[PDB]
Design a protein around this ligand. Structure first.
Ligand SMILES: Nc1ccc(CCNc2ncnc3c2ncn3[C@@H]2O[C@H](CO)[C@@H](O)[C@H]2O)cc1
Ligand SMILES: [K+]
Ligand SMILES: [K+]
Length: 544
DNA sequence: TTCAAAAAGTCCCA
DNA sequence: ATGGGACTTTTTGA
């Protein structure tokens, strides 16, 4: 339930919010952590504040009450007026209170609240806010609390949104005018469709000073999440430019230097600036060379995949072990071949073509009644009946216990089409010739009838598999973990395509590559040469 | 009725 | 034991 932020990052965030504070002008700053936990951030804040007060004690004594401002009174003052924490875990709050007391008679009152930060009536705003909020996705969040969030945090929380969206909104709302906030959250809201409303909220309510994007680097040990650090303020500024620090090597160990600033200035990161006013609903955080590249491609292409194609997600059985069998399984002798479909996984998809399938799907929707094919139900599917009965559509009666949860439309699959994995390190679009079915880890599309004369499957896999389109898609794609991007229709269908004088030769090269890849003695080397030639053709076409 | 999004991923090994 | 690499289910809101 508790996650420890590495000390280097905590130090960076506290220094980011407090390094230029004018303690003489305002000796009563309110610093808040609304998910403080054991006190990772607040103890460092206490250290920084103590040094800040102690270095200016005599100036404070001369400008204000000379009896109040003594070194012996610093500790008490810090706990009374400066440090605020909130967390829902009682034990963490008790431990933090003990630590803050032990940093150094009457008892000082420590501003630590044990509550739900999203429900607390906050009585005042704050000068500085730091911390690491909790991340809960749509599956792991309780439905009652989700009803609450959808009612009260609708500006950022809808559909498949995350709890830390609400923490972002809460932080922004309780930040004093001129205040500074700095947090570490998952990076996914920067590009995801669920994060659109949250991105709009941030852009329209704060000045984003700085974004540190670690991409697929493993910041939290033994945790599968990809992180970023956001720093924003509510200052009166007429410029609103963002400093973006994007990591270049995801294999880096984070403790190579003493400070995170040394790492950011180093050759391990790239830095660039983004105009906050030029942000659309999407945040395209790239350097000027990449921006030029992306804009050239966008302007030159007249069509998008959405215009010319029909997209769809694969089968969602709701229990794969009940419906998927190895093609050499003896139990398939009980199933009529009219009920069997070819089944592939994301790993069976290469550039341009699909591996031969090793699995079969029982399309159980076509089973009329339980008495005609009783053997299939009793001996194959029924072995998981309990689990099958706990699916949502079974509990509500919309679906029989032996039916596929989301069987889609068969006719969408039993046709020539293009398939691609839902998560990959590179563009892998293939032409499926074999009426392959797949789960939701594989997405498919086919070309609309009215665009068949303008675009062929061979040409499309030719350009989509090129290095140009690999880089082009990765510009705006959703970076998930190390060497993994989401390849989902909400972005894949936005890919723009072109049609010009190089169409015929690109198509010929694609057909040659496909012909070689379907041979017995594959000579992959000539495939690589042909791909290089096609990439040259594409770069000529797009004017890069 | 029925779409598609969602990594505090998941699991294994050296 | 940890860190790194291969690979990806079904719950869920709309
Ligand atoms: N199902 C569900 C039901 C209710 C909630 C309440 C959300 N409200 C919260 N308010 C304040 N602190 C919170 C918190 N949730 C977690 N935290 C702390 O955050 C830190 C993580 O690093 C931990 O120290 C954790 O305790 C969440 C999920
Ligand atoms: K004085
Ligand atoms: K990671």
């Amino acid at each position: 339930g508790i996650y420890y932020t590495p000390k280097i990052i905590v130090d960076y965030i506290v220094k980011k919010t407090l390094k230029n504070h004018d303690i003489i002008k305002n000796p009563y700053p309110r610093i808040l952590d609304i998910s403080c936990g054991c006190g990772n951030f607040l103890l460092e804040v206490y250290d920084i504040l103590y040094d800040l007060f102690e270095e200016n004690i005599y100036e404070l004594k001369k400008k204000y009450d000379e009896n109040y401002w003594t070194v012996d009174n610093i500790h008490r003052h810090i706990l009374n007026y400066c440090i605020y924490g909130a967390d829902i875990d009682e034990k963490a709050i008790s431990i933090l209170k003990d630590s803050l007391t032990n940093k150094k008679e009457s008892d000082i009152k420590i501003n630590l609240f044990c509550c739900d930060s999203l429900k607390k009536k906050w009585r005042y705003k704050f000068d500085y806010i730091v911390g690491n909020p909790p991340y809960i996705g749509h599956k792991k969040l309780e439905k009652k609390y989700k009803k609450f969030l959808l009612e009260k945090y609708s500006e950022v929380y809808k559909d498949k949104a995350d709890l830390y969206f609400c923490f972002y909104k809460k932080i922004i709302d309780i930040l004093k005018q001129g205040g500074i906030g700095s947090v570490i959250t998952p990076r996914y809201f920067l590009e995801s469709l669920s994060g659109k409303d949250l991105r709009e909220y941030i852009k329209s309510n704060v000045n984003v000073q700085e974004i540190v994007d670690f991409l697929g680097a493993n910041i939290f040990k033994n945790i599968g999440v990809s992180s970023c650090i956001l720093t924003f303020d509510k200052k009166k500024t007429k410029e609103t430019y963002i400093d973006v620090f994007k990591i270049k090597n995801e294999d880096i160990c984070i403790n190579k230097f003493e400070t995170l600033e040394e790492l950011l200035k180093s050759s391990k990161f790239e830095h660039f600036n983004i105009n906050q006013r030029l942000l659309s609903d999407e945040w395209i955080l790239v350097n000027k060379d990449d921006e030029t590249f992306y804009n050239k491609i966008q302007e030159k292409c007249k069509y998008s995949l959405e215009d010319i194609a029909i997209s769809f997600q694969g089968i969602i059985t709701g229990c794969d072990k009940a419906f998927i069998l190895s093609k050499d399984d003896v139990k398939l002798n009980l199933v009529d071949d009219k009920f069997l479909k070819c089944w592939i996984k994301s790993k069976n998809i290469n550039k341009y073509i699909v591996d031969k399938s090793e699995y079969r799907l029982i399309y159980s929707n076509d089973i009329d009644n339980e008495n005609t094919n009783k053997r299939i139900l009793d001996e194959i599917i029924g072995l998981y009946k309990t689990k099958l009965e706990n699916r949502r559509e079974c509990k509500s009666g919309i679906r029989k216990w032996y039916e596929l949860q989301w069987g889609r439309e068969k006719l969408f699959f039993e046709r020539k089409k293009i398939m691609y994995p839902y998560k990959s390190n590179e563009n892998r679009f293939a032409i499926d010739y074999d009426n392959n079915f797949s789960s939701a880890d594989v997405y498919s599309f086919f070309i609309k009838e009215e665009y068949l004369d303008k675009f062929s499957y061979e040409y499309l896999v030719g350009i989509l598999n090129s290095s140009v389109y690999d880089k082009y898609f990765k510009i705006t794609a959703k970076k998930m973990s190390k060497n993994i991007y989401d390849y989902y229709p909400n972005k894949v269908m936005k890919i723009r395509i072109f049609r010009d004088n190089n169409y015929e030769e690109i198509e010929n090269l694609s057909k040659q590559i496909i012909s070689i890849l379907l041979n017995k003695s594959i000579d992959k080397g000539k495939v690589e040469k042909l791909q290089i030639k096609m990439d040259n053709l594409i770069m000529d076409s797009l004017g890069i």
